[PDB]
Amino acid sequence: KNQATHKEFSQLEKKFDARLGVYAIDTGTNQTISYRSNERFAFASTYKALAAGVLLQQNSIDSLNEVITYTKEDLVDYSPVTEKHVDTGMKLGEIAEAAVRSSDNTAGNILFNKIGGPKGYEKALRHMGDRITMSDRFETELNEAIPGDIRDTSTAKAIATNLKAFTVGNALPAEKRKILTEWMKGNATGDKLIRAGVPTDWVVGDKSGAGSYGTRNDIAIVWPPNRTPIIIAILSSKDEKEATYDNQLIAEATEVIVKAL
Ligand SMILES: [Cl-]
Known part of the structure; x- marks a missing residue:
């Protein structure tokens, strides 16, 4: 379906007035589905699932019970969990969970901090052999997504490969790989995205993203019934800074991958 899937993906770009980037790999058959999979998009909040994976690589399960504190002036826009616990701090595991499950932006910034900032995040991905992802800024400036500006961008193929390493591969020991996938499962932020495009007997652990220039992303590990997982990265953006997005x-891109695999 090399050219057959190309046509369907090209048709969605026209129906939704957008640019689309797709990479999906069936971990059981190593069959891949790709469209503009080497083009750069701003990754926006999808980094939070990978940064949680780096955090888990670098810290014990025990240490996730450690309390982390922060200040009111550290709070950035859209921090619906962290804004409630300024006076007490939160457990480190709770912060990572808030970043993955709710896309809390202060929680994302703490994650960054704990793994050495955007530069530390990037260095961890380079260690896993990701040469493509570029991390430069904290929330919320990382969402600026200026076309042609490669700060805080990656490709569908690079992001999917990273997610594969953390969730099914050998980037984490089993127990932490399980912690990560559970954080990614059952979150309402994912409900209208890849979860809305797979059949009802499939299970989806995802991380959604949204940025300026109509940037709208979802990355996922998905389990068909009785079947090895498929790793999906879907990226989207538009040409106008204040553009809206359409879940x-x-x-619909997910429906295309499902039919092809
Ligand atoms: Cl304070």
Whole structure:
């Protein structure tokens, strides 16, 4: 379906007035599905699932019970969990969970901090052989997504390969790989995205993203019934800075991958 899937993906770009980037790999058959998979998009909040994976590589399960504190002036826009616990701090595991499950932006910034900032995040991905992802800024400036500006960008193929390493591969011991996938499962932020485009007997652990220039992303590990997982990265963006986005574009792209695999 090399050219057959190309046509369907090209058709979605027109129906939703957007640019689409797709990479999916069936971990059981190593069959891949790709479209503009080497083009750069701003990754926006999808980094949070990978940064949680780096955090888990670098810290014990025990240490996730350690309390982390921060200040009111550390709070950035859209921090619906962290804004409630300024006076007490949160457990480190709770912060990582807030970043993955709710896309809490202060929690994302703490994750960054704990793994050495954007530069430390990038260095961890380079260690896993990701040469493509470029991390430069904290929330919320990392969402600026200026076309042609490679700060805080990656490709569908690079992001999917990283997610594969953390969730099914050998980037984490089993127990932490399980902690990560559970954080990624059952979150409402994912409900209209890849989860809305797979059949109802499939299970989806995802991480969604949204940025300026209509940037709208979802990355996932998905389990068909009785079947090895498929890793999916779907990226989208537009040409106008204040452009809106349409969840349905991600869901329709997912339907195309499902039919092809
Ligand atoms: Cl304070």
